[PDB]
Amino acid sequence: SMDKTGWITHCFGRFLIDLPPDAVINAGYYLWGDRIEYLDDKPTELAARVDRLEQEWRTQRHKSKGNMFLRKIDFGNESVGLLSWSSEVASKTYLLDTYVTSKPTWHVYRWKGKVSVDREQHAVEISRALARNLRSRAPKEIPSEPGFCIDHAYIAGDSFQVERFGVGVTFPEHPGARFEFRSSTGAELNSLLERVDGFVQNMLSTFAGMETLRKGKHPVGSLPGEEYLVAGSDKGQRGYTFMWEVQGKEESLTEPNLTAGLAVLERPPPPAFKSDKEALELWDTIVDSIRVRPTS
Numbered sequence: 001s002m003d004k005t006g007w008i009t010h011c012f013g014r015f016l017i018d019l020p021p022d023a024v025i026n027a028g029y030y031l032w033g034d035r036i037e038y039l040d041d042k043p044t045e046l047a048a049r050v051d052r053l054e055q056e057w058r059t060q061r062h063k064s065k066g067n068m069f070l071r072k073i074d075f076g077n078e079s080v081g082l083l084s085w086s087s088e089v090a091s092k093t094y095l096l097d098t099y100v101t102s103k104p105t106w107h108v109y110r111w112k113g114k115v116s117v118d119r120e121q122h123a124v125e126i127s128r129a130l131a132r133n134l135r136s137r138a139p140k141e142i143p144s145e146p147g148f149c150i151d152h153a154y155i156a157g158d159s160f161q162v163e164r165f166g167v168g169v170t171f172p173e174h175p176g177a178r179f180e181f182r183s184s185t186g187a188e189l190n191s192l193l194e195r196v197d198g199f200v201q202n203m204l205s206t207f208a209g210m211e212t213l214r215k216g217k218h219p220v221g222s223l224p225g226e227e228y229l230v231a232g233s234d235k236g237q238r239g240y241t242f243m244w245e246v247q248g249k250e251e252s253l254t255e256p257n258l259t260a261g262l263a264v265l266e267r268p269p270p271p272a273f274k275s276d277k278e279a280l281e282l283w284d285t286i287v288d289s290i291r292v293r294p295t296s
Contacts, residue, residue, distance in 0.1 A: 011142060011149040011293065013183045014253050020291035022172045028151040032126070034113035038151040043078075046108050050080060052098070057084045060231075070094065073124055077101065080133035084118070085122065085219060092117045102153040105136035109150070113286045133157055146295045148253075160251055161269040162186070171282075177264045177272040179238070179286065185248075190192040192226040192245040201255050202230065209234050213276060218244055223258070229283070231276055237266040240279055241247045244287050260287050279292035 006021045012158035019025070029036050041049065050072075062085050073081035078101045084092035097113040111130070115123040136153045137143050146158040150165075164184040171177055188195075193215070204210055210232030218227040227244040241263045248257035262283055264272045273279040 001278065003129040003283045004285065007048075008290070009142065010167075012167055012181065013148050013150075013152070013163060013291055015183060015258070016142070016289075016291050016293045017181060017286065019286065020170060020171065020173075024172070025167060025171045026169075027151065027165060027167045029148075031111060031148075032113065032162055034111055036109050036150060037085065039108050039110055041108050043106065047076065048192050050099065052083065057082070058065065059197075060088075062088060064091055073127075075124070075128045076132040077098070078102065079127070081124065081127055081220060086114050096120070096123050096127070098130070100131045100134050102134050102136035103107045104139075107136055107151070107152050109134070124175050130155065134245070143294050144294070149293070158253065160226070160253060163256075174272045174282070175270055177279075179262045180260070181290075182259045183256055184258075185251075185253065186239055186249045188245075188247045188253075191247045192228060192243065196228065200230070204230075210239075213280070218287065220288055222292070223255070223290065225258075225287070225290075227287075228271075229280070229294070231279075232266075234266050238262040238264070238271065238273070238276075239266040240272070242283050244290075254292050258290075260290065 004018060005025055007018045008021055009018050011018055012027060039046070049225070052139040054058045054069060056074060057278070058067045060068045062068040069082040070084045070085065075081055080099050082097040084095045084097070086095050093114050093116050096113060096115050098188045100111060101108050117276050135156050138150065143149070143154055143227055145156055145158040147215065148155040148161070148163050162185045166199060167180065167184040169179040204212065207235065210230055213229040213231050215228055216226065223246050225244050225246045229242045232239050242261060244260040
C-alpha cells in the first residue's frame with residue numbers, strides 16, 4: 001500500500017490515478033451518453049464489418065415496404081458512419097453508427113447512438129470532429145495535451161463535452177475486494193454526506209455488527225472530496241464499504257462528479273485484508289493519488 005514501489009500511474013478521462021502492478025483493470029468510456037468502444041480490427045476487418053452491416057440493414061424491413069438503411073456517411077480522417085432508422089417503426093429518429101479511427105497509430109472505435117431527424121446533421125458534425133480529435137497514445141504514454149483519455153487513445157480538446165468513465169479494479173493479493181473509480185460531467189445536487197448520512201446512521205443504529213471507521217472531509221489536492229467508510233463483522237468475515245466523492249461543478253471537465261469506492265462482501269473464503277489498518281492504507285494510497293492530468 002503505502003510503499004508505492006512498482007505502482008503504475010494510469011489514465012482515465014481527465015484524471016490520473018496510481019495502482020499496484022498486480023491490479024486487474026477494466027474500463028468503460030462514454031461520450032454524449034453513448035458508449036465509445038474499442039475494437040481490435042485491422043483496417044480490412046473494419047471494412048468487412050461495415051460492408052456486412054450495411055447489407056444487413058438493407059435486407060431488413062422497415063414499416064411496410066421499405067428497408068432500414070438510409071446512408072453511409074464519410075467523416076473523413078479514415079472514419080465512417082452508418083445511418084439507419086431507429087427501429088422497424090420509423091418514428092422520427094435514426095441510429096447513427098459511428099466508426100472513428102485514431103491517429104497516427106491505427107485503432108478503431110465504435111460510437112453508436114440514436115438521433116432525431118432534426119438533429120442528424122448536428123450529430124454528423126460531432127462525429128466529423130471526433131474523427132479529427134481522436135488521437136492515439138502510446139502504451140505507457142501520459143499525454144501532455146488537453147483531452148479525454150480512453151482505451152489506447154484520447155479525445156483531444158478542452159472544449160466542453162459530456163463525458164464519463166467507469167473503471168473496475170480487483171487485486172490478486174486482496175481477493176474478494178473490488179475497487180471502482182468513476183468520472184461523470186454534471187454536478188450532483190447533494191454532497192456525499194448531505195445525501196447518504198441520515199440513512200447510514202439509521203442502519204447503524206438499527207442493525208448490529210458495523211461501525212463508521214471514518215467520515216467527513218478528505219480533500220485530495222484541489223479536489224474537495226468527502227468520504228464515508230463503514231466496516232463490520234459477520235460470518236467470521238470482515239466486510240467493508242468505502243466511498244470518496246467530489247460532487248463536481250456544472251459544465252466542467254476538470255471538476256466533474258468524481259467517485260472512488262471499495263467494497264468487500266460477506267457470505268470462510270480467504271481474507272481480503274489482514275486488518276482494518278491494511279485496508280485503509282490501500283484505500284488512502286489510491287484515493288490520494290487521484291489528480292487531474294497536468295495539461296499544457
